[model samples]
Target: IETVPVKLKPGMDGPKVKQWPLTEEKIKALVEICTEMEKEGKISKIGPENPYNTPVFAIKKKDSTKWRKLVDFRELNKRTQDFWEVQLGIPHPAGLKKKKSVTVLDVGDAYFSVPLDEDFRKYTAFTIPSINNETPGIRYQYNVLPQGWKGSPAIFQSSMTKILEPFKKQNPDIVIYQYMDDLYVGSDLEIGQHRTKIEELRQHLLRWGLTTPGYELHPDKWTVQPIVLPEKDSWTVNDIQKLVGKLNWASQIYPGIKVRQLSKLLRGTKALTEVIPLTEEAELELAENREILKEPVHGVYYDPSKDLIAEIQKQGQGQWTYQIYQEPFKNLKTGKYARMNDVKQLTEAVQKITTESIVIWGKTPKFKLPIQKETWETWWTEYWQATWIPEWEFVNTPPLVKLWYQ
Candidate 1:
């Protein structure tokens, strides 16, 4: 397993943000877990506040619907070093075309299992909830890799890679891709074969099992400040500063506003009324300024599947890969596969198949493999039958379907 030292900024301490508003039910849930961890010595209470002591908040787990204690380490992170997220490479696209299956697994309490260095535990000190408002809360530090540390993902990822390397070498068929604590196992054999390897793979990862932020999206992250219509009765210095910052940037890019004059006025003095009635010229410019947000800032018309589209467009070569979720072609004698990325192309490929010019050949792209005109009619006839329709159609599934299919 990989180990990472929690590094702090040069002569900087942790951030001290306020705790989030917690409900009684949420506090009870938070305290219950923290109390148990404390008793087990996984966490301990700090006697007094330190320069690195951060704040904590209560949040509910998305799937579990259970409360979790979150620490605000933003201040500490500002000066923290960047940890590289090693990307899990995609399995051979040709494998997806073949008779292959994918099994996803998750590590339980992923970060918590890694032992934290005693010297850096001070950086993770966070407050825990008490029974109620009458009692005071206690501060505690994590003994293991805390959930919200900046270096946690890299540490876990490196550790898991080190653990799984040996197993992968022995079982060449069992190609495993790890993204953080979650793992995706791909095999050309049946799920039964996949399970046997997964069982063996678990021996090295004891606390790891089936795959099961603290900085929640700031609620007002996307909120746009309206300059024309003032909703609030009064504006504070902080409020005006935020608006001026936004306006200053808008003035730089778009030539609509009185950039120099207003920027100078707002910068010199923080005085700002809630409803600073706009002049006719200022109003017109403000309306022009709004086009900055209305117009598209940045976007691309290509699929980020990365190289495929660019290569195909530039080279005038059409290609498709079964690297991601390819299914076996229905009812072909050769047992080959046909894949499609979009509807228009899928329909086009189907039409070509009807003309008897193209045929599925071991996941080969169009025109690359030798023609098999005789199999064309039969391939079309069995496409629906052999397309591997998931039986979950009968069951009421969630909006985001579960990746693990038993």
Candidate 2:
């Protein structure tokens, strides 16, 4: 609810760049969404003289029915300073040991809920191309915390931490884990008590001007799930890094999942853009790791009443338990426009002859036959009869005849 003004590094000035061009369909879609946002007071039309100007584009939504407008803030982010050094660690679901009830609260349109400081609004200016050809493109800037800003997450996390501090102090028994706008509230007490605490937390969040949409409260249980991977024969370092990122969180939840082979594969590569052939060993390792992820381990549970035991043992020399977490072709052009019809006829004749004579096809069929004179003759006769010869010359003869001459 509080207006947090963003700060830039010393001597840093706003970027002034031309907006990227969009298709007529996308321009119309963006204009419609921008109009709605302006009506909601989240953004306002600004003058062309605004110091900052960034490109804006629209990407397809998940359902592919609508578009989501996005502003390119890379240039602006380069000049922005860090908001704070607050470490907001998100607690793993498995970390909530012996919990009876769990509820996750999601703040709807979280960034838009926070108003931007009036003085700093000009720095977020973006230009949208006009649908009409004659009219000039309109410039607009966000009145609220806009998405794609580098420091937005830090600023929002710091604000949420401040807002939830008092609630944590008052309700010491409830377990709450906040990751940006998502808050996971867990309780070891009865289901009714957990529900009451969730309601109280919701009320507290509302008091701080944060709203939560409809969410479910359920029994505490975590499922080990597998994530998607690109179906590719070769992969770049970026692809492997993405796979590692998803598995990293899963490793944290399930300690038994091993990331040794993945780490080795990642360490062997240098440049992220360089494509490396995926070896059989690496493919097998990936399959095995995915299989391990499919194991049915409900969740981690611990009893406070029982004494915890620490077991340590030495491993063999070479054996170690890795139970750790982690071309276009150029077209030939004929002569210029003066003898247009003659040139077209000549080119068409050449093209037709080239197409009929030279054949470029992939995956030729294989023929299997016994090494006998009668069998070979029968196969050769059938093949020669089946295939069409462009001309009756020696050059256009069947492959068998050419082989015989060779």
Candidate 3:
């Protein structure tokens, strides 16, 4: 399935690296895979003086300690011009608002499914130096869009756009999301309607001879986990890029997360390069957003104890206060005070205060809803989940000072 052709920049030298160092076992594994791929017509032998020659290395598959051969397309990608016009809009949960059902999919062997142009196949060629007399120095090149190619993602996405464009207009309320080759379909309709759309999409995928691995919005891999930071000004470009990518992953599942600003840390580097500075702003932002992601779900404590409320308010501010106060909200279902950490913790404290019509000392206290119908649903949607119990409907009925004495 030939798609877009590669467009190289003028005066491009292609890749300069000729040979890669691999472990003995890895070398054997690489040769075996390349040999099999050649037999299957996925790769072919290449000659010398090829402008796009590079090295090959092996990385173990996740969880299993098995090696897969990967091409070192770094230098080649730099020399090869990226006319790859990619749209980076991947759907997040926030975009799935009011959706009753969601269908998720993974594009199997996504890039390889789009066969490479025959003319540009030589550019992806890599060489593995012979480790012994039994083996001779051999060069192999991919005939399909191999992983790590800069333009592969963009090509795949743009091709998919042709299929999705007409389908979206035909079904007005249906929402679709694509991240790289992963696809998600969200709808407010019945499961049958959503399933029908899924089948339509599956058939389209079948036409392309691509397999789609499916799932819905999944959990965070490292939710609330700690992160390691290198010494300031010591981070390489790869470190910064990897950190940014991880933060982006965290932000997708947890909305309102502030990690997107960390991309500004790479402001000056057009391409990923070494020696990028780790600015103080970027470092602090990452730390702050990390904590936001740790919470992930949104809820505020109703009538949170003076200390618990104090602790919650203390976050995200640079100010410091010097004061001492007596403990408040001593009564609890359990002997220990509700620490305001769990979403379920603050309910008792809320009930204790709101029964007497005393307002909780926060900007927007929980366990209360608006009296008027105007802001009722919006208030719940914006701040609290359905789990919150509304003790009273707040209204303009009471004067500010009179309520203090109540």
Candidate 4:
């Protein structure tokens, strides 16, 4: 695999930042992680001569079992120039509905898998506090692409696409979707056939050096399943965010599942530790979402040979909504017609016409209308000249006031 360089804006220099003060436990955890990374050749100790430096810290993982080391690259990222326009080849969740089975594979240490060019290593330098009481803090830099780099995702995604493009071209029967380091392989055939295709894709990935021997592919995580909510009376902000994010992705497959009400749960504050007691309405919404997940309506199978029908309806007053249905709808038991509901809602109130004048009708007028006699007269004159046809003959010429009712 080719190494990537960090491209910066013209005349821009790297930041020399100091490390943030860390708790003793966090410091110990970060030191351990860095030691492992150094042994694996992912990172290396740098000399004091390196001009660039960034702060490194550690945060607990979701399971709280391990601490994930991170570098604060905000200052450096601001000056870096990202040149690549990455194309994610993954299909929409709705598109995957036609397949009989789908499996997801996450690339282990996705960013670390890509090597960084030697010339750019100094720019990625970071400071790690001393693990020993007597020794001074050490400086280290990443030999491979590191997390928290602004351009890492784009560069990694582009490289992975190039590596996997050949496999996609050769196998026309299987669908291999690439989203950065995650690979979603779908098949319309039986589960056995799906497993075979996944193994073939895995072989290609291994051949291209995308995964290492230490990386273990969890067979259980490959299958798709509904997200499980935490069983508790009160929820944390972090819990709600995780649930909302998962349900939002699932909404693409089951379009009927109502997510509008879910937004109500995330209103003012976003502090992850903040606790929120569920209201009756919130509980009902969660219940409904769970019910929908139990029996999801899969996406309709797309057939080029079939006719596409679009249906639009005028919803409440002036609003509009639409849905697109495929003709000769078969497999009704498993699939549903593609729909886009509540596309438009009333935003402004309609004007009310009086016997002698036009008036705005709403509790609060968003904008002022011309009600003064002089302003109304000027507006009326402009409208008459633009729209009136003097030479046209009519059975009866109705007054402008009378025409307002129609």
Candidate 5:
């Protein structure tokens, strides 16, 4: 039979059972640890206790009093019910995705443990201390361990951080995070540059007590991306050019502004503009309203209200795109917080996005959605899962986990 390899959806279904082998020693260790933690007060609930819990209810109907299976195949089947069985060589699925994976966690220990007192906690270990199910060979449950049970993520991060702190501090260019099995390190985007850094960074982390779960998470293994720094001093001619292209045939909103500005912005560079499309006053109001700024400015198609200025400086002769933090590009606007359907066209049009809400641990650095194409592809249709959300469902869960080291 011709079978196709499939993308694994994280779910399982089967009759309930006590899968965790209850060897006397394993049970003894768990009891002892729980007793110790109970005295400490780390107890908190997740699986059975949380409203979002996916109990193996279906299997229970047929299997009687067995504990829920470690994973219910039926639950997985339900979750992936609508998952499009993607076909090959089609532009539909490919074009729809526009968001990319972008997160910022600078080099350091701050990534994992969110500064605990006296002792450390591991989010992974503490959250689900043991996997319990009556079924054999499939024990998967996230019951808590009394006192140290909460914030399993933080606990997980601390242990990894402490282990790598000493050796990680040795280098300036390389970076690793104990909080996540993911990281961005070294500026070697080229083939050799990437490989060399991966090898070196690997050797360094291993030297510092860190281990690679195979080389999958290795820096060099990641896709290399072009880091574009918008111009500060160079917005002059180019910024004007982009505006001109977008100016409606009759520059009613900023008439005649485009013609003259384009000349000045283009003077010392290659094409100053990338792409610009004109729209009505309503359009101008959408990009940015003149009413908001209340002040007239000359460097951009839409106004940067509140003195959000795009610098008009110069870089190498005929070369634009520099210090993006000031003027035009600076005051970088939030493109859109909600994920979009088409990321490629959207990101090019929207550029960058910043978060308005702060996270639980702290406000994360601004994340430009759809940072890369692959990023968009991986998460673009994620919104589709909304259809599968069970009715009257009540549960709380982290939106998503993004970890970084200090």
Candidate 6:
């Protein structure tokens, strides 16, 4: 019932607290930086950006409608969109026009909803790119929404804009842009220049008392140097090398080394490393992912099942604790098959079904489901009732489960 407002009175109880003083110097810097970026011409002289040719970037994202400039899916409660992705396969012709490759980097958090009055009225009030990362009230309870109150993004945006205002005023090549939590900044190949820029940005962030994702925060501080990815490497983060030396080995695991491959990898010059040493925690966390890929897959056909049941049996096949086999399902509505071993097809079907159900208040229309009478009991014991899916926190049951029950 409350709102994500951008301003508040000092001392009044609100979701966010006050941090910035709207210092005159801060505002001046931002105006200057914007002016500089505006003059630099965003085009790059480096090799072309191959958006189409690059490895695709995809994720099963929770709907971030508000973060997107287009629609406000939450207020309308519209059907969530399909799985989305982007491929930085090639640099746009314009990006290629720049005199230099993207080197200096700017790091910003997802959301900054706290305080800072003057700048709020100055710029970036209604929109900040990272704002959409907030957890939807309709879905999860306890989101990462920092400051937890009005203009959370706005306050942070304003405050940041001010800190940056002075830098911006300097006509620095550095640039900063944000939507909610995602922030972007750019700089030339200046060696320690990034360090100085980051230090300045950090001062403002600390000054305003903005909230950051605990271990979740990416750079841990603002201003990063981008890695100069080879024409062959896809992507690179210049800051990784800078951070690696100082960060603990354990903390350097995830985005740690991965950031170095940005430009080259993004251009399809090199492939991302599939195997990085896993953090102690990631090793266990990834157990299931590794297991599924290694799990003895079962391919289920019509009424009969188990291609190697005897081997499993002989192997203790009887002593064998269990087996995994799929059950074929034919949906009369679409005349499509379900629960097959074709991983790509099966994955698509499941997503399609989930999306369809989501579209209709999370329900599917009635369909007559047939039960395999002969093997009904064994199938029930082996899979229907006995499979080990309970350990997971999130579960999606197959359509066949209901079809057979009906």
Top model by TM-score, which number? Answer: 1
Candidate 2 off by > 4 Å: 63-66, 85-108, 131-134, 157-406
Q: How accurate is candidate 1 locally (lDDT)?
A: 0.44
Among all windows of ten consecutive residues in candidate 1, which has the lowest summed lDDT?
A: 307-316
TM-score of each: 0.42, 0.40, 0.41, 0.41, 0.27, 0.23
User: How many pairs of residues in model 5 come into backbone collision?
Assistant: 55
Model 4: how large is the Cα RMSD against the reference?
Answer: 24.5
Every model: Cα RMSD to truth: 23.8, 25.6, 24.0, 24.5, 20.1, 26.8
Error of 2 at 53 (Å): 1.5
TM-score of decoy 5? 0.27
Consecutive 10-residue window with the lowest summed lDDT within model 3: 315-324
Backbone atom clashes (below 3 Å) for every candidate: 5, 0, 1, 0, 55, 76
Writing each residue's lDDT as its tens digit, candidate 3 over 109-163 gives: 5565557888777667777866664676687778887765546655666666676
**In model 6, where do residues sit more than 4 Å from their true spots?**
1-159, 211-406
Count residue pairs with overlapping backbones in model 6: 76
Of the pair 4 and 5, which is ahead by lDDT? Answer: 4
Q: In model 3, where do residues sit more than 4 Å from their true spots? A: 1-5, 62-68, 86-110, 113-115, 129-134, 162-208, 211-406
Candidate ranking under TM-score, highest first, comes to: 1, 3, 4, 2, 5, 6
**lDDT of every model, 2 decimals:** 0.44, 0.51, 0.50, 0.52, 0.30, 0.27
**Residues 266-369, model 4: lDDT tens digits:** 88766789897777787888888877766635655655334333322232334332223444222111211122212112111111111001100101111222
